[PDB]
Design an enzyme around this catalytic site. Structure first.
Site, short mmCIF file in Angstrom:
data_model
loop_
_atom_site.label_atom_id
_atom_site.label_comp_id
_atom_site.label_asym_id
_atom_site.label_seq_id
_atom_site.Cartn_x
_atom_site.Cartn_y
_atom_site.Cartn_z
N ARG A 173 -5.41 5.37 -7.76
CA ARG A 173 -5.20 6.79 -7.94
C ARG A 173 -5.09 7.21 -9.42
NH1 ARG A 173 -0.45 9.47 -4.82
NH2 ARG A 173 0.36 7.40 -4.24
N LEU B 84 0.91 -1.14 0.00
CA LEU B 84 0.00 0.00 0.00
C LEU B 84 0.95 1.19 0.00
CD1 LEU B 84 -2.52 -0.66 2.99
CD2 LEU B 84 -2.87 -1.25 0.56
N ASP B 85 0.50 2.30 -0.57
CA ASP B 85 1.30 3.50 -0.61
C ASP B 85 1.50 4.05 0.80
OD1 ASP B 85 1.52 3.53 -3.38
OD2 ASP B 85 -0.41 4.63 -3.69
N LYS B 86 2.59 4.79 0.97
CA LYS B 86 2.94 5.42 2.23
C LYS B 86 1.74 6.05 2.94
CE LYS B 86 5.52 9.49 3.75
NZ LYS B 86 6.69 10.46 3.50
#
Length: 252
Positions: free
Chosen positions: A163, A64-66
């Site tokens: 996104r 998962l992104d930061k």
């Protein structure tokens, strides 16, 4: 060797002999990399369960992104990580997300467009015929005046997939510092709405549900991570705004 264990607390939602499921907060990178040599989930895992060092990449099988919050499953054993990796290659792991996108959307749907690195903006990914196939399914859960709450499911799991796909169809996520622009509150928005929107500084994206066939027992398992407070506050103020602008009588 290289990556060291670090005392970084993790929110363990579920754990058994074979897997660990966590609810990852924002400001926490999953794997070490350029600009993030340490302080990642990998470091936290090495500290929490040192035997995980004998597992490839500390058992990390998806990321998962930061600044994306939510569920992730990690393998504690070699057999478990090979099976989990296989399950992902076979698109047999359900990963559902809740998100808030800019703009009034009228319909749910599917975005099926390949993804590759933006050739010019090195911080961006992009939709391109020559990219890796990517498919994102989305449903509208609730309408706001000029934002929409969505639930999405990942068929594929490419970099920045949700996104970039949402941005691709003209509805980037609220707070996305890469694909989003400046916040645009609706006319007449309350001060509470305006400032809550303005201060929301991460993609409004959360990995809310995760379902899979346990890598060792084969039992189907499912987990949920509550919507985090930042998004609760965001959704609630947008909801209050939509209601307040409805064309209905205010009975006294």
């Amino acid at each position: 060797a290289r990556f060291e264990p670090q005392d970084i607390p993790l929110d363990i939602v579920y754990e058994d002999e074979d897997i660990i499921v966590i609810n990852k907060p924002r400001d926490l990178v999953v794997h070490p990399g350029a600009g993030n040599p340490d302080g990642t989930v990998l470091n936290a895992l090495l500290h929490y369960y040192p035997p995980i060092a004998d597992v490839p990449r500390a058992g990390i099988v998806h990321r998962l992104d930061k600044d994306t919050t939510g569920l992730m499953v990690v393998a504690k054993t070699v057999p478990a990580q090979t099976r989990l990796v296989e399950s992902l290659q076979r698109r047999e792991i359900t990963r559902e997300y809740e998100a808030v996108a800019i703009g009034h959307m009228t319909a749910g749907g599917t975005v099926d467009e390949p993804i590759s690195r933006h050739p010019t903006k090195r911080t961006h990914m992009a939709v391109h015929p020559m990219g890796k196939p990517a498919v994102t399914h989305y449903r509208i859960m609730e309408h706001f005046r000029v934002h929409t709450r969505l639930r999405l499911r990942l068929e594929t799991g490419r970099t920045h997939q949700i996104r970039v796909h949402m941005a691709h169809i003209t509805h980037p996520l609220v707070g996305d510092p890469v694909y989003g622009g400046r916040p645009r509150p609706p006319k007449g928005a309350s001060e509470a709405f305006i400032s809550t929107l303005r201060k929301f500084d991460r993609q409004a994206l959360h990995a809310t549900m995760l379902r899979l066939y346990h890598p060792i027992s084969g039992i189907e398992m499912e987990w949920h991570a509550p919507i985090p407070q930042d998004m609760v506050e965001l959704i609630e103020v947008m909801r209050a705004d939509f209601e307040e602008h409805k064309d209905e009588v205010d009975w006294l």
